[PDB]
Structure 1
Amino acid sequence: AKQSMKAREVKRVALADKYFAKRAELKAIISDVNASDEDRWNAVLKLQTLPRDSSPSRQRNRCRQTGRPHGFLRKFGLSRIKVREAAMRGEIPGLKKASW
């Protein structure tokens, strides 16, 4: 991928982890039905106050080694090409050709 794109991922994840404490304890008020609409509205408007890419939903899953949005495996953490290369070279334990 691009250097700017890769830096965007770390910049988003850092601010998402830093503000994770506020996001959960702020959406808790919204989720709590037993609350006043005056505090519900305040919580709703205060959540849009923090910077946008501060949520886990606003980040992608580019592969660590190279960087590729389309094509990824959560268990392996790399794109399809890199996963195949690692499997063929033996870097992934207990991974062989499936044939049933």
Structure 2
Amino acid sequence: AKKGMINRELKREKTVAKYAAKRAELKATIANVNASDEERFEAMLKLQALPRNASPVRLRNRCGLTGRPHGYFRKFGLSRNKLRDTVMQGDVPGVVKASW
């Protein structure tokens, strides 16, 4: 991937982490049933007024080594090319060629 795309991803994670608490608070206030309808409406308005990059749905998993956005394999944190290389070198504990 390009350095610009990697830095974009990093900035998005930073924004999500910065706004994590207030987003959860507003969502809880929205879900509150004892709260007033005006209170829940205001909470919804503030949630919609939060910056876009605060939303976790805009994060994309990228390979931890190269930044590739396809074939991620959450468990290892690496895309398929680097995963194949590392597994066949033997630096991934417990992973072996599978046959049955």
TM-score (norm 1): 0.94
Identity of aligned residues (%): 63
Number of positions where the alignment pairs a residue of Structure 1 with one of Structure 2: 100
Query: Which residue of structure 1 aligns with residue 56 of structure 2?
Result: 56
The match for 1:21 is: 21
- Could you list the runs of 4 or more consecutive aligned residues of structure 1 that deviate by over 3 angstroms after TM superposition? none
Provide the aligned C-alpha RMSD in A. 0.9
Structure 1 match to 2:71: 71
Equivalent residue number for residue 47 of structure 2: 47
AA of the residue aligned to 1:9: E
Cα distance in structure 1, aligned partners of 2:80 and 2:31 = 39
Whole-angstrom CA distance in 1 between matches of 2:69 and 2:32: 36
Deviation at 1:55, TM superposition (A): 2.1
Q: Could you say which residue in structure 2 is the equivalent of 1:98?
A: 98
What corresponds to 1:88 in structure 2? 88
Q: Bigger relative contact order, structure 1 or 2, given CA contacts below 8 A and separation 6+?
A: 1
* Structure 1 alignment gaps of length 5 or more: none
Q: Deviations over 1:17-75 (max 9, x none)?
A: 11101010111010112221111110011012221011222100010100111110111
Matched, 1:36 2:52: no
Q: CA deviation at 1:6?
A: 0.4
Residue identity opposite 1:45 in structure 2: L
> Which consecutive residues of structure 2, in runs of 5 or more, have no partner in the other structure?
none
